[PDB]
């Protein structure tokens, strides 16, 4: 008088986008009539085996078939059935053969639609790619829509990669640091999903037009030197570019400051040596023209 | 490869089609667009190719707009 045995020969009669009709063979009841069956399932996205909802809500001991409901479209499933009598629940059956649910249109929008940056004449649109369990079908891609803020129609483009997270539009009509209305949708082989809400992304700005001036330097130690200049499209910081007397400007080291600090310190230099230093403004679009070079010794 | 951005005026529709099994010419993908706008009682105003696979592609994107 103990719990019943495990069912055998789990089979998928049919499967849809959200349902799966199963059948099984009964095991030994262990002298106690099997009163009910219960079903579990497992996907690559579940925490191991998890219980499922069924129709009927209660699968009786006389039921050798049932319909599992509320599944996720385009997801690979496997099922198992457990017998249960008056004494207690029994051992689970062996897993069914793997079966992928049918597909449908995507029901979600790309998360964290945003953008900005790039070189002048560019508009950068980004988004978090949709994870596999929400794509709901093969041929998953994206549709990107954008326009200058306040325009009538839209510019749209199909981005077919399911892992696409960025679309870059470049055109001579793109004005620098100008606002654009942007919305991103999704699609698969069965159709198109919904667009996200309209957000405003700014186009790329222009690199600094002028160079800093009055570049001067003085050593602090055998390896450290203090550099200062004069301030001047916006600027987010300055880029130092330095090399020693026996080198060339192109094969040099770089150092970037943030803000309007106007001063910086260079470490790692050699003592009793002459170096050349260049200061250059920058923003997100790149650098501007450089200042005239200064030479200092350690 | 980067897909062309197509202009979609008001009451126009943006459509697209692709199949990873196919590898068809530009002229084929044009006729796909012209017919799809046609059986919608709309004209073809803008289109471009998707997914290159020599002058052959796996998909197409286009814009249909009402007639007259």
Residue numbers in the entry:
A (entry chain A): 598 to 829, 836 to 901
B (entry chain B): 124 to 176, 178 to 192
From the paper:
Contactins (CNTNs) are neural cell adhesion molecules that encode axon-target specificity during the patterning of the vertebrate visual and olfactory systems.
Surprisingly, subsequent structural analysis indicated that a proteolytic event had likely released the growth factor–like domain of APPb so that only its copper-binding domain bound to CNTN4 (2.93 Å, Rwork/Rfree = 0.241/0.281). Overall, the CNTN4–APPb and CNTN4–APLP2 interfaces display many of the same features found in the cocrystals of chicken CNTN4 and APP. As is the case in previous CNTN–APP complex structures, the bulk of the interactions includes main chain–main chain hydrogen bonds between two β-strands: W751–Q753 in CNTN4 and L129–P132 in APPb or L134–P137 in APLP2. Furthermore, CNTN4 residues Y784 and E789 form hydrogen bonds with E141 and H139, respectively, in APPb, and with E146 and H144, respectively, in APLP2. These contacts are absent in the chicken CNTN4–APP and mouse CNTN5–APP complexes. Overall, the sum of this crystallographic work indicates that the CNTN4–APLP2 interface in zebrafish is essentially identical to the CNTN4–APPb interface in zebrafish and the CNTN4–APP interface in chicken.
